[PDB]
Amino acid sequence: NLTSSKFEEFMTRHQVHEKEEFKALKTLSIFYQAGTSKAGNPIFYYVARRFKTGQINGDLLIYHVLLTLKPYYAKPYEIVVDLTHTGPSNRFKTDFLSKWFVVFPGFAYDNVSAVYIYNCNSWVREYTKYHERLLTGLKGSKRLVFIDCPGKLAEHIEHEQQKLPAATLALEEDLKVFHNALKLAHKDTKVSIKVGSTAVQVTSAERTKVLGQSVFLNDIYYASEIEEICLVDENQFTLTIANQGTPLTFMHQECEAIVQSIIHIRTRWELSQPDSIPQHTKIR
């Protein structure tokens, strides 16, 4: 016995406004409205990074999102979702996911002008496969438009109005490209590796099918998270990362050239961090 009217009344009766945990969401800048688009519809930006699985009550997040969309969701609107550096830590459970379909009044769903997805990664694709049933409605969705490369979104969105996260742009994908690196694994897929200043971004060069739309996956690994860096051979190198099980092996004609930078990147962070002596504390 739950509906949009019921949910709104309950939360309104609850004093969520002064909880001081609702206020924190404003600082985190999750689902903030950003200017307009080519059609003139307002734009909103949802940041996947900013949400932890359990540290905060999940209903307050919905109320904040609903509150912001209430004034404008009557008219058609465009929403862009940033899934950069998505991880299992920031996720929606099966039960909590379902509420999104029902809590909103329902007529706003029809006012979804267009959807933009940026900096998707394989983990997100894996999540969709597991939760396919609930998302079957969005299967082959016309409103879903995937930003395969950065050079496309700026065209469709009003440039100088888009306000994507500064940290995302800070990476800028502005470092050397080791084109035609091959990801040796059960199956081999061409991966383009950029050794960024503070992180390493692996951009696949082969399109993949997610919800019936082709897109290129771009996994991002922060330099701080690079615990293990082993160069087994100049033909291929080994990159094990925290709680990732089997390491990632790739083939490049000059592995030490890439690994040299990775060691250079990691070594710089070691100086940046205050204390590397505290470590471990967990035996898997």
Side-chain angles (χ1 to χ4, degrees):
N1 308 116
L2 179 63
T3 57
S4 64
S5 57
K6 300 171 183 177
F7 174 84
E8 177 58 23
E9 204 288 333
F10 172 76
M11 303 297 287
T12 297
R13 178 160 34 81
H14 223 5
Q15 294 199 334
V16 303
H17 283 278
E18 59 77 30
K19 281 284 182 177
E20 304 181 358
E21 303 173 355
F22 193 85
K23 306 180 184 182
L25 298 175
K26 181 178 179 180
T27 61
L28 299 179
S29 304
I30 322 182
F31 194 85
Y32 64 91
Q33 193 283 336
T36 61
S37 65
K38 292 285 178 180
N41 311 328
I43 301 176
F44 310 97
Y45 285 114
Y46 165 80
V47 194
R49 303 150 162 174
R50 306 292 193 274
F51 171 73
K52 301 304 183 183
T53 179
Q55 291 187 8
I56 58 180
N57 182 287
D59 292 2
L60 292 175
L61 174 56
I62 288 173
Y63 188 82
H64 171 83
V65 172
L66 172 55
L67 195 64
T68 55
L69 268 172
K70 189 178 182 63
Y72 315 110
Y73 68 164
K75 237 205 174 185
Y77 53 88
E78 300 178 359
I79 283 174
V80 182
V81 49
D82 164 67
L83 303 183
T84 314
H85 188 249
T86 308
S89 65
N90 45 33
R91 57 170 296 189
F92 293 171
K93 293 175 179 175
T94 304
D95 56 326
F96 173 76
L97 176 57
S98 60
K99 283 202 181 186
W100 299 85
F101 297 89
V102 52
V103 171
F104 293 104
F107 77 98
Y109 297 145
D110 304 359
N111 304 336
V112 176
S113 175
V115 191
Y116 295 89
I117 297 170
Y118 194 63
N119 288 10
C120 63
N121 49 259
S122 64
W123 180 97
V124 178
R125 178 184 178 185
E126 298 180 345
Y127 183 93
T128 301
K129 298 167 172 170
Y130 185 57
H131 293 81
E132 168 53 22
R133 199 179 183 185
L134 299 178
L135 304 178
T136 187
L138 303 178
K139 187 69 170 185
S141 175
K142 301 160 187 175
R143 306 170 187 173
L144 291 178
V145 188
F146 292 78
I147 305 154
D148 287 6
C149 64
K152 291 170 179 177
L153 184 61
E155 306 177 11
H156 289 9
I157 288 181
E158 285 281 10
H159 192 281
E160 307 179 343
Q161 301 188 234
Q162 41 67 35
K163 213 70 175 181
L164 275 66
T168 297
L169 299 176
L171 292 161
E172 201 183 3
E173 316 178 2
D174 67 327
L175 262 289
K176 314 107 183 186
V177 192
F178 298 84
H179 293 257
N180 299 329
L182 192 65
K183 175 183 177 183
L184 275 50
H186 301 267
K187 298 181 183 180
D188 286 4
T189 299
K190 220 68 170 178
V191 295
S192 56
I193 300 176
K194 289 185 175 182
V195 184
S197 59
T198 60
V200 175
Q201 304 188 16
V202 179
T203 300
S204 59
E206 299 182 13
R207 246 157 179 177
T208 58
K209 284 290 184 180
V210 181
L211 299 177
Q213 300 193 32
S214 301
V215 58
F216 300 101
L217 302 178
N218 170 28
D219 307 5
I220 299 174
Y221 308 99
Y222 292 176
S224 177
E225 302 179 22
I226 311 182
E227 301 177 354
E228 314 180 18
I229 308 92
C230 178
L231 172 59
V232 298
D233 184 10
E234 302 299 344
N235 307 15
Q236 56 179 357
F237 55 79
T238 304
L239 294 178
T240 332
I241 305 295
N243 68 269
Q244 306 311 331
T246 180
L248 310 176
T249 301
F250 311 85
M251 180 180 67
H252 197 267
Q253 70 114 342
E254 47 170 353
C255 291
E256 68 84 10
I258 296 167
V259 173
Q260 169 272 359
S261 185
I262 298 170
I263 300 169
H264 156 50
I265 271 65
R266 209 304 194 277
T267 50
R268 196 185 72 267
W269 176 88
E270 297 297 349
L271 303 174
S272 307
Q273 52 74 21
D275 309 288
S276 179
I277 308 311
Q279 59 205 301
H280 189 64
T281 76
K282 176 260 270 170
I283 60 175
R284 200 77 214 187

PDB file of all heavy atoms in Angstrom, residues 218-237:
ATOM      1  N   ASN A 218      34.756   2.120 -20.825  1.00  0.00           N
ATOM      2  CA  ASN A 218      35.948   2.842 -20.375  1.00  0.00           C
ATOM      3  C   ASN A 218      36.097   2.630 -18.871  1.00  0.00           C
ATOM      4  O   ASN A 218      35.552   3.398 -18.074  1.00  0.00           O
ATOM      5  CB  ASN A 218      35.855   4.324 -20.725  1.00  0.00           C
ATOM      6  CG  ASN A 218      36.953   5.145 -20.078  1.00  0.00           C
ATOM      7  OD1 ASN A 218      38.041   4.639 -19.801  1.00  0.00           O
ATOM      8  ND2 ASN A 218      36.673   6.420 -19.830  1.00  0.00           N
ATOM      9  N   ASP A 219      36.833   1.593 -18.486  1.00  0.00           N
ATOM     10  CA  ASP A 219      37.133   1.362 -17.081  1.00  0.00           C
ATOM     11  C   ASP A 219      38.229   2.313 -16.616  1.00  0.00           C
ATOM     12  O   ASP A 219      39.191   2.579 -17.342  1.00  0.00           O
ATOM     13  CB  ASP A 219      37.563  -0.086 -16.856  1.00  0.00           C
ATOM     14  CG  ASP A 219      36.565  -1.081 -17.409  1.00  0.00           C
ATOM     15  OD1 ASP A 219      35.582  -0.647 -18.045  1.00  0.00           O
ATOM     16  OD2 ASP A 219      36.761  -2.298 -17.207  1.00  0.00           O
ATOM     17  N   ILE A 220      38.078   2.824 -15.396  1.00  0.00           N
ATOM     18  CA  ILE A 220      39.001   3.792 -14.817  1.00  0.00           C
ATOM     19  C   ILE A 220      39.559   3.211 -13.526  1.00  0.00           C
ATOM     20  O   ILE A 220      38.798   2.747 -12.668  1.00  0.00           O
ATOM     21  CB  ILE A 220      38.313   5.144 -14.555  1.00  0.00           C
ATOM     22  CG1 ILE A 220      37.799   5.733 -15.870  1.00  0.00           C
ATOM     23  CG2 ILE A 220      39.277   6.107 -13.864  1.00  0.00           C
ATOM     24  CD1 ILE A 220      36.987   6.995 -15.699  1.00  0.00           C
ATOM     25  N   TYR A 221      40.884   3.236 -13.391  1.00  0.00           N
ATOM     26  CA  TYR A 221      41.574   2.754 -12.199  1.00  0.00           C
ATOM     27  C   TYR A 221      42.378   3.906 -11.612  1.00  0.00           C
ATOM     28  O   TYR A 221      43.322   4.394 -12.245  1.00  0.00           O
ATOM     29  CB  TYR A 221      42.480   1.569 -12.532  1.00  0.00           C
ATOM     30  CG  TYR A 221      41.781   0.456 -13.278  1.00  0.00           C
ATOM     31  CD1 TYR A 221      41.899   0.337 -14.657  1.00  0.00           C
ATOM     32  CD2 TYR A 221      41.006  -0.478 -12.604  1.00  0.00           C
ATOM     33  CE1 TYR A 221      41.262  -0.678 -15.343  1.00  0.00           C
ATOM     34  CE2 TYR A 221      40.366  -1.499 -13.282  1.00  0.00           C
ATOM     35  CZ  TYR A 221      40.497  -1.593 -14.651  1.00  0.00           C
ATOM     36  OH  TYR A 221      39.862  -2.608 -15.330  1.00  0.00           O
ATOM     37  N   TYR A 222      42.007   4.342 -10.411  1.00  0.00           N
ATOM     38  CA  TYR A 222      42.765   5.384  -9.734  1.00  0.00           C
ATOM     39  C   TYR A 222      44.168   4.886  -9.404  1.00  0.00           C
ATOM     40  O   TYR A 222      44.377   3.712  -9.088  1.00  0.00           O
ATOM     41  CB  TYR A 222      42.055   5.823  -8.451  1.00  0.00           C
ATOM     42  CG  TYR A 222      40.748   6.564  -8.662  1.00  0.00           C
ATOM     43  CD1 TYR A 222      39.970   6.946  -7.577  1.00  0.00           C
ATOM     44  CD2 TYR A 222      40.297   6.890  -9.936  1.00  0.00           C
ATOM     45  CE1 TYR A 222      38.779   7.624  -7.753  1.00  0.00           C
ATOM     46  CE2 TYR A 222      39.107   7.568 -10.121  1.00  0.00           C
ATOM     47  CZ  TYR A 222      38.353   7.933  -9.026  1.00  0.00           C
ATOM     48  OH  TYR A 222      37.167   8.608  -9.205  1.00  0.00           O
ATOM     49  N   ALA A 223      45.137   5.801  -9.477  1.00  0.00           N
ATOM     50  CA  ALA A 223      46.520   5.431  -9.188  1.00  0.00           C
ATOM     51  C   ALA A 223      46.676   4.963  -7.747  1.00  0.00           C
ATOM     52  O   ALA A 223      47.392   3.991  -7.476  1.00  0.00           O
ATOM     53  CB  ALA A 223      47.448   6.611  -9.470  1.00  0.00           C
ATOM     54  N   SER A 224      46.015   5.645  -6.808  1.00  0.00           N
ATOM     55  CA  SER A 224      46.106   5.250  -5.406  1.00  0.00           C
ATOM     56  C   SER A 224      45.666   3.807  -5.200  1.00  0.00           C
ATOM     57  O   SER A 224      46.193   3.115  -4.322  1.00  0.00           O
ATOM     58  CB  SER A 224      45.260   6.187  -4.545  1.00  0.00           C
ATOM     59  OG  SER A 224      45.270   5.780  -3.188  1.00  0.00           O
ATOM     60  N   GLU A 225      44.705   3.336  -5.994  1.00  0.00           N
ATOM     61  CA  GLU A 225      44.192   1.977  -5.873  1.00  0.00           C
ATOM     62  C   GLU A 225      45.117   0.930  -6.480  1.00  0.00           C
ATOM     63  O   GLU A 225      44.829  -0.266  -6.357  1.00  0.00           O
ATOM     64  CB  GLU A 225      42.812   1.882  -6.531  1.00  0.00           C
ATOM     65  CG  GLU A 225      41.786   2.847  -5.959  1.00  0.00           C
ATOM     66  CD  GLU A 225      40.443   2.750  -6.655  1.00  0.00           C
ATOM     67  OE1 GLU A 225      40.166   1.699  -7.271  1.00  0.00           O
ATOM     68  OE2 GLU A 225      39.665   3.724  -6.587  1.00  0.00           O
ATOM     69  N   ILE A 226      46.209   1.336  -7.125  1.00  0.00           N
ATOM     70  CA  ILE A 226      47.109   0.396  -7.797  1.00  0.00           C
ATOM     71  C   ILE A 226      48.083  -0.100  -6.733  1.00  0.00           C
ATOM     72  O   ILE A 226      49.167   0.452  -6.538  1.00  0.00           O
ATOM     73  CB  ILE A 226      47.823   1.035  -8.985  1.00  0.00           C
ATOM     74  CG1 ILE A 226      46.821   1.764  -9.884  1.00  0.00           C
ATOM     75  CG2 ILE A 226      48.566  -0.023  -9.788  1.00  0.00           C
ATOM     76  CD1 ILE A 226      47.445   2.398 -11.111  1.00  0.00           C
ATOM     77  N   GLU A 227      47.686  -1.165  -6.033  1.00  0.00           N
ATOM     78  CA  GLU A 227      48.543  -1.741  -5.003  1.00  0.00           C
ATOM     79  C   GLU A 227      49.690  -2.545  -5.603  1.00  0.00           C
ATOM     80  O   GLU A 227      50.823  -2.472  -5.116  1.00  0.00           O
ATOM     81  CB  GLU A 227      47.715  -2.624  -4.067  1.00  0.00           C
ATOM     82  CG  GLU A 227      46.587  -1.893  -3.359  1.00  0.00           C
ATOM     83  CD  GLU A 227      45.746  -2.815  -2.499  1.00  0.00           C
ATOM     84  OE1 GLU A 227      45.973  -4.043  -2.544  1.00  0.00           O
ATOM     85  OE2 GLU A 227      44.859  -2.313  -1.778  1.00  0.00           O
ATOM     86  N   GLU A 228      49.419  -3.313  -6.657  1.00  0.00           N
ATOM     87  CA  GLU A 228      50.382  -4.250  -7.222  1.00  0.00           C
ATOM     88  C   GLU A 228      50.651  -3.897  -8.677  1.00  0.00           C
ATOM     89  O   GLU A 228      49.714  -3.705  -9.458  1.00  0.00           O
ATOM     90  CB  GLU A 228      49.866  -5.689  -7.120  1.00  0.00           C
ATOM     91  CG  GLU A 228      49.275  -6.042  -5.762  1.00  0.00           C
ATOM     92  CD  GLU A 228      48.769  -7.470  -5.697  1.00  0.00           C
ATOM     93  OE1 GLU A 228      49.169  -8.284  -6.558  1.00  0.00           O
ATOM     94  OE2 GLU A 228      47.970  -7.780  -4.790  1.00  0.00           O
ATOM     95  N   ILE A 229      51.932  -3.817  -9.036  1.00  0.00           N
ATOM     96  CA  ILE A 229      52.345  -3.580 -10.415  1.00  0.00           C
ATOM     97  C   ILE A 229      53.512  -4.502 -10.736  1.00  0.00           C
ATOM     98  O   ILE A 229      54.653  -4.238 -10.337  1.00  0.00           O
ATOM     99  CB  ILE A 229      52.733  -2.106 -10.648  1.00  0.00           C
ATOM    100  CG1 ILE A 229      51.628  -1.168 -10.160  1.00  0.00           C
ATOM    101  CG2 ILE A 229      53.018  -1.859 -12.122  1.00  0.00           C
ATOM    102  CD1 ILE A 229      51.793  -0.717  -8.719  1.00  0.00           C
ATOM    103  N   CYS A 230      53.240  -5.587 -11.457  1.00  0.00           N
ATOM    104  CA  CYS A 230      54.258  -6.556 -11.840  1.00  0.00           C
ATOM    105  C   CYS A 230      54.404  -6.570 -13.355  1.00  0.00           C
ATOM    106  O   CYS A 230      53.417  -6.741 -14.077  1.00  0.00           O
ATOM    107  CB  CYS A 230      53.901  -7.957 -11.333  1.00  0.00           C
ATOM    108  SG  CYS A 230      55.081  -9.241 -11.812  1.00  0.00           S
ATOM    109  N   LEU A 231      55.636  -6.389 -13.829  1.00  0.00           N
ATOM    110  CA  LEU A 231      55.961  -6.486 -15.252  1.00  0.00           C
ATOM    111  C   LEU A 231      56.567  -7.866 -15.486  1.00  0.00           C
ATOM    112  O   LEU A 231      57.774  -8.069 -15.345  1.00  0.00           O
ATOM    113  CB  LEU A 231      56.910  -5.368 -15.672  1.00  0.00           C
ATOM    114  CG  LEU A 231      57.475  -5.450 -17.092  1.00  0.00           C
ATOM    115  CD1 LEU A 231      56.361  -5.446 -18.130  1.00  0.00           C
ATOM    116  CD2 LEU A 231      58.445  -4.305 -17.343  1.00  0.00           C
ATOM    117  N   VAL A 232      55.714  -8.826 -15.846  1.00  0.00           N
ATOM    118  CA  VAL A 232      56.184 -10.193 -16.048  1.00  0.00           C
ATOM    119  C   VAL A 232      57.118 -10.267 -17.249  1.00  0.00           C
ATOM    120  O   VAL A 232      58.144 -10.957 -17.212  1.00  0.00           O
ATOM    121  CB  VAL A 232      54.990 -11.156 -16.195  1.00  0.00           C
ATOM    122  CG1 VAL A 232      54.150 -11.157 -14.926  1.00  0.00           C
ATOM    123  CG2 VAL A 232      54.137 -10.791 -17.406  1.00  0.00           C
ATOM    124  N   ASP A 233      56.785  -9.564 -18.328  1.00  0.00           N
ATOM    125  CA  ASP A 233      57.590  -9.606 -19.540  1.00  0.00           C
ATOM    126  C   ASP A 233      57.329  -8.345 -20.349  1.00  0.00           C
ATOM    127  O   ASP A 233      56.320  -7.661 -20.158  1.00  0.00           O
ATOM    128  CB  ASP A 233      57.279 -10.858 -20.370  1.00  0.00           C
ATOM    129  CG  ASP A 233      58.171 -10.992 -21.589  1.00  0.00           C
ATOM    130  OD1 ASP A 233      59.154 -10.229 -21.696  1.00  0.00           O
ATOM    131  OD2 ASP A 233      57.889 -11.860 -22.442  1.00  0.00           O
ATOM    132  N   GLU A 234      58.261  -8.043 -21.256  1.00  0.00           N
ATOM    133  CA  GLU A 234      58.070  -6.924 -22.169  1.00  0.00           C
ATOM    134  C   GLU A 234      56.905  -7.156 -23.120  1.00  0.00           C
ATOM    135  O   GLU A 234      56.361  -6.189 -23.662  1.00  0.00           O
ATOM    136  CB  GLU A 234      59.351  -6.673 -22.967  1.00  0.00           C
ATOM    137  CG  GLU A 234      60.572  -6.382 -22.108  1.00  0.00           C
ATOM    138  CD  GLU A 234      60.408  -5.135 -21.260  1.00  0.00           C
ATOM    139  OE1 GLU A 234      59.494  -4.335 -21.549  1.00  0.00           O
ATOM    140  OE2 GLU A 234      61.192  -4.956 -20.305  1.00  0.00           O
ATOM    141  N   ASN A 235      56.522  -8.415 -23.345  1.00  0.00           N
ATOM    142  CA  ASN A 235      55.378  -8.700 -24.204  1.00  0.00           C
ATOM    143  C   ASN A 235      54.064  -8.389 -23.499  1.00  0.00           C
ATOM    144  O   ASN A 235      53.130  -7.869 -24.118  1.00  0.00           O
ATOM    145  CB  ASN A 235      55.413 -10.161 -24.650  1.00  0.00           C
ATOM    146  CG  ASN A 235      56.738 -10.547 -25.278  1.00  0.00           C
ATOM    147  OD1 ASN A 235      57.730  -9.830 -25.152  1.00  0.00           O
ATOM    148  ND2 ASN A 235      56.761 -11.688 -25.958  1.00  0.00           N
ATOM    149  N   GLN A 236      53.973  -8.698 -22.206  1.00  0.00           N
ATOM    150  CA  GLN A 236      52.753  -8.468 -21.447  1.00  0.00           C
ATOM    151  C   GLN A 236      53.109  -8.172 -19.998  1.00  0.00           C
ATOM    152  O   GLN A 236      54.110  -8.667 -19.477  1.00  0.00           O
ATOM    153  CB  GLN A 236      51.808  -9.673 -21.527  1.00  0.00           C
ATOM    154  CG  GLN A 236      52.430 -10.984 -21.079  1.00  0.00           C
ATOM    155  CD  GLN A 236      51.454 -12.143 -21.147  1.00  0.00           C
ATOM    156  OE1 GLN A 236      50.282 -11.963 -21.482  1.00  0.00           O
ATOM    157  NE2 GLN A 236      51.932 -13.340 -20.829  1.00  0.00           N
ATOM    158  N   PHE A 237      52.272  -7.363 -19.353  1.00  0.00           N
ATOM    159  CA  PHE A 237      52.459  -6.974 -17.965  1.00  0.00           C
ATOM    160  C   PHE A 237      51.252  -7.394 -17.134  1.00  0.00           C
ATOM    161  O   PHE A 237      50.167  -7.657 -17.661  1.00  0.00           O
ATOM    162  CB  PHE A 237      52.682  -5.460 -17.835  1.00  0.00           C
ATOM    163  CG  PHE A 237      51.597  -4.629 -18.461  1.00  0.00           C
ATOM    164  CD1 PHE A 237      50.392  -4.433 -17.810  1.00  0.00           C
ATOM    165  CD2 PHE A 237      51.787  -4.037 -19.698  1.00  0.00           C
ATOM    166  CE1 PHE A 237      49.394  -3.669 -18.382  1.00  0.00           C
ATOM    167  CE2 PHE A 237      50.794  -3.271 -20.275  1.00  0.00           C
ATOM    168  CZ  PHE A 237      49.595  -3.087 -19.616  1.00  0.00           C
TER     169      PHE A 237
END
